[PDB]
Amino acid sequence: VLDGPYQPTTFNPPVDYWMLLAPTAAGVVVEGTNNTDRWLATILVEPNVTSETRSYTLFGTQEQITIANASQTQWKFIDVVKTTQNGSYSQYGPLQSTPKLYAVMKHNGKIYTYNGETPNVTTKYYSTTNYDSVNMTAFCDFYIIPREEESTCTEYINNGL
Numbered sequence: 001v002l003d004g005p006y007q008p009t010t011f012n013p014p015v016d017y018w019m020l021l022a023p024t025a026a027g028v029v030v031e032g033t034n035n036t037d038r039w040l041a042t043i044l045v046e047p048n049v050t051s052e053t054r055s056y057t058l059f060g061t062q063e064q065i066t067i068a069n070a071s072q073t074q075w076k077f078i079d080v081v082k083t084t085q086n087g088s089y090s091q092y093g094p095l096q097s098t099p100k101l102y103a104v105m106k107h108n109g110k111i112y113t114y115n116g117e118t119p120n121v122t123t124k125y126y127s128t129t130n131y132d133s134v135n136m137t138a139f140c141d142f143y144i145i146p147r148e149e150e151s152t153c154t155e156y157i158n159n160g161l
């Protein structure tokens with residue numbers, strides 16, 4: 001019944017569907033923009049990292065970002081966001097994860113991602129103009145899950161495939 005895995009690509013996902021991402025290596029997991037007031041890129045950070053500046057390619061250009069992960073044993077998924085073309089990148093609420101899975105959804109004028117610490121995750125959102133036409137670039141294999149089945153996606157985030 002599980003819909004995937006799909007290979008890395010750029011496409012325009014339907015609204016009200018979770019794109020469940022299964023990265024294997026540290027680094028950029030997925031990116032999305034409306035080209036006007038919202039840019040979002042999720043970075044997967046290794047367990048146990050003291051504050052350091054790193055370089056990432058985001059939307060095809062090199063960017064310097066200060067990263068940390070206080071967890072000894074858990075991964076850290078960080079959404080790096082800007083709200084204008086030339087604006088600086090900011091970080092908001094992470095997901096600390098054992099299973100190494102993440103998800104993103106276009107819903108109700110916003111982009112939603114998962115949040116908190118496995119195995120007790122929640123969701124968070126970012127208001128996004130023209131939310132429905134946002135193209136997403138996946139840099140790893142992914143699956144597609146309807147919002148109606150959100151509880152299944154939440155189980156995967158919490159517990160793995």
Ligand SMILES: CO[C@]1(C(=O)O)C[C@H](O)[C@@H](NC(=O)CO)[C@H]([C@H](O)[C@H](O)CO)O1
Pocket residue numbers: 081083092093124125126127
């Ligand atoms: C304007 O308010 C909001 C938004 O509706 O967007 C509320 C939302 O909870 C918040 N999300 C979080 O803090 C997620 O951790 C979001 C966020 O600060 C900005 O979108 C960042 O650019 O701002």
